[PDB]
């Protein structure tokens, strides 16, 4: 059986990568970063409460101008808020009520949402007709859209539930690059600050670092045990942190190909639903299923506070690009802005 | 007062947007949502054609001043847990089992049956965390082909512990009770089991009666009586 010798070839390749990583790591993050004095406690007050969603919210994304944010929900509604003055800038009605993700374009002219209808539709905010209309429907996946993020006004990567990430091209309509290699249910997605790489998480507890330019899986990170739910880069671009269903949040590293710290706690027994990083990268914020977000000192693995404000499961979370505030959505249908 | 003219018009634009979200939520909270489930070729398409006249498939039908939405999810060949937590708060579940598939072993992994996979599916859906109060409207499909297939072959192939003389009544009642036994909690949920065929003329009334019971419970929940 040539498949058996091919499998033992792959097994010794696993062995080589395992001892390469083991010889690669000498000191952890916590041994060399124990000597920095900790933050301590952080008291973030709910500065705003954006209400107007009626069913559960699974998605949120901040603007690059750090003032407008978009949010998606199961009442078929995509709402752009003015986070300073709680005003609803726009309210987009969706053709499919089952949406699991949303993005807000870096230029600010587009939003994209997609869900169980296997289509990450794209909506045009800036219109001469005054209304938000749908511009392109990106129908090429056979599993549900778990994440879709804009690279540019014309390019968008779409994580999907059919194990496949896909670089798209909004002008034509067709996926120029297809990213395969995960074995179950790709759940999340995070773009590099230079937007030339991206990571993704799946339900085989593996985080794969990709390459937008050619379309290959450059690295693979396996340190979890349960299904990865959300993922995020460190702001420097060299590291990323992820969160899975085993109440464990891990900070992996691109340039060393390694896990740096585990941000688990002995008291937490519910799955992370969303993660994000602060502007300096000092804080890691993780949404949770026990209804409240937890802030973590990213360099000491200490919980620096709890953003307890929600009645139901925190589903989505994000820090602004100026680092000013944190918006958390939840299943009780209330965005809260913390500062 | 301490606002501009433009920020004043922004505030009233947001108030109009609030108003339209309120109307659309009141419209969408008075319609009945049903999650249609089942195995492969269980007769789900048959009852879609009965109640009517890629990705998720949604069916709109109305019946006696009640507007229904029925969400077929058979095309979702993915992990069930994520998109099944997206489906809580649904009024009822229409679960489809074909009676005639008791002796049909599965087309893939030939050691395994349709009926025991349908039992495994029913156990996972009924004992779910997200469906602890949801009334399951079980539909038992193809009674006619079950008659011409139980006149010739016994049900002891699928249920050897069954002890009956292979007629229309007791074999169907045994497999009905075998499906009903799959609850851990028989006091929260209410399972509504029906027998039907493609020729059967009125079985949307069964769904209507089950959702009228669920609507009574939700009307009492909305009046504080829970």
């Amino acid at each position, epitope marked *: 059986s040539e498949l058996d010798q091919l499998r033992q070839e792959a097994e010794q390749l696993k062995n080589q990568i395992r001892d390469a990583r083991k010889a690669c790591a000498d000191a952890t993050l916590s041994q060399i970063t124990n000597n920095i004095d900790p933050v301590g406690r952080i008291q973030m007050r709910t500065r705003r409460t954006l209400r107007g969603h009626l069913a559960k919210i699974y998605a949120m994304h901040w603007g690059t101008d750090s*003032r*407008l944010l978009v949010s998606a929900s199961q009442d078929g509604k995509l709402i752009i808020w*003015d986070s300073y*003055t709680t*005003n609803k*800038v*726009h309210a987009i009605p969706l053709r499919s009520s089952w949406v699991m993700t949303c993005a807000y374009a870096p230029s*600010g002219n587009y939003v994209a949402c997609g869900g169980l209808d296997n289509i990450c539709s794209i909506y045009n905010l*800036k219109t*001469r*007709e*005054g*209304n938000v209309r749908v511009s392109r429907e990106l129908a090429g996946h056979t599993g549900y859209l778990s994440c879709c993020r804009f690279l540019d006004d014309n390019q968008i990567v779409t994580s999907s539930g059919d194990t496949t990430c896909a670089l798209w091209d909004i002008e034509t309509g067709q996926q120029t690059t297809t990213f395969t290699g995960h074995t179950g249910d790709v759940m999340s997605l995070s773009l590099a600050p230079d937007t030339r790489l991206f990571v993704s998480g799946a339900c085989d507890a593996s985080a794969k670092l990709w390459d937008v330019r050619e379309g290959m899986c450059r690295q693979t990170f396996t340190g979890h045990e349960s299904d990865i739910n959300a993922i995020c880069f460190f702001p420097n671009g060299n590291a990323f942190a992820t969160g899975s269903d085993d109440a464990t949040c891990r900070l992996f590293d691109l340039r060393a190909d390694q896990e740096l710290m585990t941000y688990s706690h002995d008291n937490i027994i519910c799955g992370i639903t969303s993660v994000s990083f602060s502007k300096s990268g000092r804080l890691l914020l993780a949404g949770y299923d026990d209804f409240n977000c937890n802030v973590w000192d990213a360099l000491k693995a200490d919980r620096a506070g709890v953003l307890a404000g929600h009645d139901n499961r925190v589903s989505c979370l994000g820090v602004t690009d100026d680092g000013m505030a944190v918006a958390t959505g939840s299943w009780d249908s209330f965005l809260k802005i913390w500062n | 007062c*301490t606002l*501009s*003219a*433009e*920020d*004043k*018009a*922004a505030v*009233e*634009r947001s108030k*109009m947007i609030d108003r339209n979200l309120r109307e659309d939520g009141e419209k969408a909270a008075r319609e009945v949502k049903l999650l249609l489930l089942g195995a492969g070729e269980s007769g789900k398409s048959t009852i879609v054609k009965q109640m009517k006249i890629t990705g998720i498939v949604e069916t709109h039908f109305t019946f006696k001043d009640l507007h229904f939405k029925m969400f077929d999810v058979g095309g979702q060949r993915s992990e069930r847990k994520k998109w099944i937590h997206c489906f809580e708060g649904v009024t009822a579940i229409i679960f489809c089992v074909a009676l005639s598939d008791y002796d049909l072993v599965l087309a893939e992994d030939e050691e395994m049956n349709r009926m025991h996979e349908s039992m495994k599916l029913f156990d996972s859906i009924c004992n779910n965390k997200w469906f602890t109060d949801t009334s399951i409207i079980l539909f038992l499909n193809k009674k006619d082909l079950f008659e011409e297939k139980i006149k010739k072959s016994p049900l002891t192939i699928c249920y050897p512990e069954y002890a009956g003389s292979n007629t229309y009544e007791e074999a169907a009642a045994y497999i009905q009770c075998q499906f009903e036994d799959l609850n851990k909690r028989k006091d929260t949920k209410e399972i509504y089991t029906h027998f039907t065929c493609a020729t059967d003329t009125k079985n949307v009334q069964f769904v209507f009666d089950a959702v009228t019971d669920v609507i009574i419970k939700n009307n009492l929940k909305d009046c504080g009586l829970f």
Partner: single-chain antibody, 233 residues
Framework: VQLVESGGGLVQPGGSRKLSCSAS????????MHWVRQAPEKGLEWVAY????????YYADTVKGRFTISRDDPKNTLFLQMTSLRSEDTAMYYC??????????????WGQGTTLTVSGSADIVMTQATSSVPVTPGESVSISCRSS???????????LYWFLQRPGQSPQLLIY???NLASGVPDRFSGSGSGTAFTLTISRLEAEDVGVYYC?????????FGAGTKLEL
């Protein structure tokens, strides 16, 4: 996107006439509306403002309580009901479209206008330092407009607008909120200015920049224009 305006013409003094403006081509139910008039040789002059959903209505203090603005949302048609047509209401009535959310560009699309020939001490007054500037093409120009109160609100938005009227054409929008270009306006235009002092800097002038340039404030109501500077070749 077109705003064709009906009605208008030669009337009797003390008469009544309903001017109309039928929108077609956009979501007019989500747009605020204005009427802005100009005399046959003076600058523009704001008349009224009905908003989306007819909730909030202001008027010019010259004609408050005597005009009547009224929108129709299903048929997408805008009305101005005028009674007792005095001789100071001989003007060119424009149907202006505007929309107010964060990042929006009010006063962007204007109607073709309609002529109607008939035979306030806290208002912030806009002063234009000239009315005629002779400029050769390819030359950098600076048009100045002066306020009487600081237009920098506490939120940060400086509600100053810069319009343009080609001779024979309807007004367009060039600069909204003192520093932001409109869409379709070439990037050679650049307004800037501190509190009460505003300069619109045209650069590399061509033949299509010849016209009269208006500075409107939008801090409060009524909306007040400057005199306007007719640029010449």
């Amino acid at each position: 996107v077109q705003l064709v305006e009906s009605g208008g013409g030669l009337v009797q003094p003390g008469g009544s006439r309903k001017l109309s403006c039928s929108a077609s081509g956009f979501a007019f139910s989500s747009f605020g509306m204005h009427w802005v008039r100009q005399a046959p040789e003076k600058g523009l002059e704001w008349v009224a403002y009905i908003s989306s959903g007819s909730g909030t209505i202001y008027y010019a203090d010259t004609v408050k309580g005597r005009f009547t603005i009224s929108r129709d949302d299903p048929k997408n048609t805008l009305f101005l009901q005028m009674t007792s047509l005095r001789s100071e209401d001989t003007a060119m009535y424009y149907c202006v479209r505007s929309i107010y959310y964060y990042g929006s560009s009010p006063f962007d699309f204007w109607g073709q206008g309609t002529t109607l020939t008939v035979s306030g001490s806290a208002d912030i007054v806009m002063t234009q330092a000239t009315s005629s500037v002779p400029v050769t093409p390819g030359e950098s120009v600076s048009i100045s407009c002066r306020s009487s109160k600081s237009l920098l609100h506490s939120n940060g938005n400086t509600y100053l607008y810069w319009f343009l009227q080609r001779p024979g054409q309807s007004p367009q929008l060039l600069i909204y909120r003192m520093s932001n270009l409109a869409s379709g306006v070439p990037d050679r235009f650049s307004g800037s200015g501190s509190g009460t002092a505003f300069t619109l800097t045209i650069s590399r002038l061509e033949a299509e920049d010849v016209g009269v340039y208006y500075c409107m404030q939008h801090l409060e109501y009524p909306l007040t224009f400057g005199a306007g500077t007719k640029l010449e070749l």
